[PDB]
Symmetry: D2
Subunit: 295 residues, 4 copies
């Protein structure tokens, strides 16, 4: 036997950073969960108990905090690129660094209609994420995403015209609820290294904003023929709006809301046009995925 | 042996309701998780296999949906009171109904700066809850609450002057982070029945709004001497603002953010006044509780 | 306004302890999650920013570790009693200590059919818990419990003879699945203090063993008329077997497994007597509770 | 823009099946969570609202239940292969089926030392899983795994000799706790189709048993130089014991248990050789991965 692949490091490293403006008193906070996994010439740590090649995961943890102290932690695409570059540059025998960052929301509070200088609210579990793969001699591959964006529309979703055979019981519908948890990823063209990433820094926040805007507006406004068709429209527009993106991925559950037939009780009418009370279903759920690239 | 207490019913009943305005096209959604547990002369179902006294929990489930079809589901204090009253009135041998409702957020989307008529976003896992105890001959006892309201302030929290003895290692501080998950409950004076609850319907939404407003503003503005002192100020104000409340309860974790001493690395200064990067601690956590009544 | 109730302390304190036998090499591990909340003359910490009365929760944490170092952590009823007694004895102004302990399973591994001296497996998320309330001048009140014990029986559960009215759709059945998560609590007669608790130490492990044995055997062997009737039989027997228990509480969800009618597909028969494939339902669920005392 | 990849189906489909022996009365239960995602000529459902190419996910759900009714659900490798083969054979335009199965534990109860014929206990959240990828013209690729196997050893783990530089604070140790959650995957050589899978049916349960046995024994007996070195030994042995496996993957967190220095309190000695009470750390955690193939 032989090692075919190996990567190791520290997961679930929680990180907070504050920025304080001396002149204005305005503080700004960032909170993240970081994972760094390293690859390189480390196979003998597995096969020969040779720990000399191990950069201890405890030290990877320390390095995450130190890097956050000495560099901007925003946008996360930049921070991850700086962090991953560090490991491959500092250690000759380490040839890739895999940096995953989950950014947690801390939105500034409005109190009596004015922004407060140092108080924040977690306005949802929606996350902004990056996957930054820094590979020696092969640049920096970045995937950016938003996840946990939970939405519902109460009409203007349809699903009819699907295949019907001996396995089919679902009725066609021209008016249903659609609810999902949006997982949307935009994959950047390869960067040659940290310099190139830095040359594009403003595009990271702007493209996240575009992705979120397009997601929400398309969801709200598309009289949806299916989850498939709606998600494709989102992907199309994001590609049109940022040429440095190569592909857009969506992964969307269809979180079903079932009608409840109550006609058995006093002839109560709660289906079709008269549907007002529904049963949200925890499981099962449709799962719809696609990756959209340029023609 | 003998039954000293008994209650039974259906938990985790998920409920959605939509309201559609024919004239304007504007739809409004509500989503809840409901639990109903009944008490009464049911001890023989436990001791003598006498199921004749059981209102099947499946039927309790049906009744929840039917009640939601035939009545407003907002404010949840009203809906729970209607639902609980039903069981004690319909079944001679049922003498109490315990109704717990968790309301989930579906906030109307703003698209290109205008409210959308049928699309919604879950802007956090913060919940609005009620516990409605309907007891035959003893009226309706309601506890209202908000929970899962997660906040952080990056300065203007202190903790000094606490007891110090041979078990103490914590350093006094005049500037720390404070973060919590707010669980705040306001307990209504007893209502004699459904009529009295109905006479106060507008006060339920208004008092929830007050509780949330007071929580956030006091958290943001109090240069906090401790969690104890800050939460008490919140409770005080809520009691002052709604005379039909008898008590206010807060349950607040102190979700610690620890400084990280990095001076071991190149003499990096990241403590005290120079603290910028912190380690959020998942556990343990302080837990601070109080119930405030009127003097 | 005035403080009507107050308690504060440290939650989610994770604790491991190892015992090593020098003579045999056999090591034994214990792992717990501890919560300690204190009451006493502490109201001025809430109303007057008077932190002098606060035993810092950080110090409560330290004390938990120190107490675990200097005393047995098993049985948890004893450990909690020692810990709670400490706070009320050490601090004149603290008059109650509320100690909650969740014990996590670490079962010794059997390797090639012999017990291993220092390797363990978590053979489920089933917990053994205590709630120890140490109240100055009022002794020690202990509730012991097992929770997260998940079981299923595939036949010999029935449910028929329940009330039927205009809200009822459930069919009577003489053969169904029953699955639950057992939450069982036994409440000890008040102890006057730590000495009395110590006088009964062997009864704590034995009564937990009895409770678990009775639960499992009664679940397996009772041709159940309902959840109500089966749980009562468990409670009865536990009371019969330990006179120092005053009451037994069960809280049992009915985790439904629904038949699936497949006759629409090639006339496939999968109901009643021919039922083989079922749909486990995540929600809703029945919830059945009772407290049983002595006649 | 254009679809570069697409797959869709039903996730979180809960399935129970019972087998009843008429002659002996002995019943046996299986419970799973199933996900099926399909690929094929379905791009027009995304780009042209062409639902005619969609096998509705609701129908995929039905098919899962029907397949479970008409076939053995054990071993899960076989069931998944039957299920995936169905979709690619039944639908000309569907060319791959991705079947993920999580098997939940229902272990027969022993009551008064004899196996009970129809009562079961969930003896942990450890899962047995399969990922079965059925690809038209490319056979059946199966990955089998065990996950959620949580273990601890209280000594005979070491970690010394690792790289030390200006980022390192971790002390070398010759005696520490090691605890992990085992995620172990064995990847089968490609099968040409369902016939070939069937020809190997007994090897699936046997190889899972071997993987679990080797994991536990190696964990218990290896005086571990590191997580890396121990996991490699497990992988080596599994490959040696089943020639139809091509690779073995392990993914192991190092769930840290920290010493607690209590010498500040009455000179209490709880480190090194005197370490008895530790603080389990929820986060961060090491994460160690490798894929082992044959030389
Ligand atoms: O938008 C949908 N897409 C599907 O593929 C599908 N399948 C299904 O059952 N309902 C839906 N809805
Ligand atoms: O506000 C606080 N209250 C306490 O009771 C306490 N105890 C502690 O350790 N830190 C804090 N902070
Ligand atoms: O054992 C049961 N008890 C009930 O109270 C009940 N109600 C119900 O719908 N099914 C069951 N089953
Ligand atoms: O077995 C270990 N491997 C590592 O890579 C590592 N890194 C670390 O900090 N502790 C450990 N332990
Ligand atoms: Na390198
Ligand atoms: Na009544
Ligand atoms: Na005292
Ligand atoms: Na095909």
């Amino acid at each position: 036997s032989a090692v075919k692949a190996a990567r190791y490091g520290k997961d679930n490293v929680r990180v907070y950073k504050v920025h304080k403006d001396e002149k204005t008193g305005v503080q700004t906070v960032y909170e993240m969960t970081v994972c760094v996994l390293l690859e390189g010439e480390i196979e003998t740590s597995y096969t020969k108990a040779d720990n000399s090649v191990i950069v201890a995961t405890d030290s990877i943890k320390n390095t995450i905090y130190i890097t956050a102290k000495q560099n901007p932690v925003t946008p996360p695409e930049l921070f991850g690129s700086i962090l991953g570059t560090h490991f491959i540059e500092k250690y000759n025998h380490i040839h890739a660094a895999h940096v995953n960052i989950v950014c947690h929301r801390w939105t500034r509070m409005d109190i009596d209609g004015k922004p407060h200088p140092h108080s924040f609210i977690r306005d949802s579990e929606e996350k902004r994420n990056v996957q930054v793969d820094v590979v020696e001699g092969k640049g920096i591959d970045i995937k950016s995403s938003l996840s946990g964006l939970t939405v519902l529309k109460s009409t203007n979703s349809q699903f009819w015209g699907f295949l019907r055979d001996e396995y089919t019981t679902l009725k066609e519908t021209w008016d249903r609820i659609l609810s999902t948890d949006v997982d949307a990823t935009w994959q950047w063209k390869n960067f040659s290294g940290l310099q190139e990433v830095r040359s594009h820094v403003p595009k990271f926040d702007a493209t996240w904003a575009t992705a979120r805007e397009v997601t929400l507006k398309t969801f709200a406004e598309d009289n949806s023929a299916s989850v498939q068709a709606t998600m494709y429209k989102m992907a199309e527009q994001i590609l049109a709006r940022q040429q440095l993106i190569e592909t857009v991925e969506y992964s969307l559950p269809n979180k079903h809301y079932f009608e409840i037939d109550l006609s058995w009780h006093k002839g109560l009418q709660n289906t079709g046009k008269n549907a007002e009370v529904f049963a949200p279903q925890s499981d099962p759920n449709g799962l719809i995925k696609c990756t959209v690239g340029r023609s």
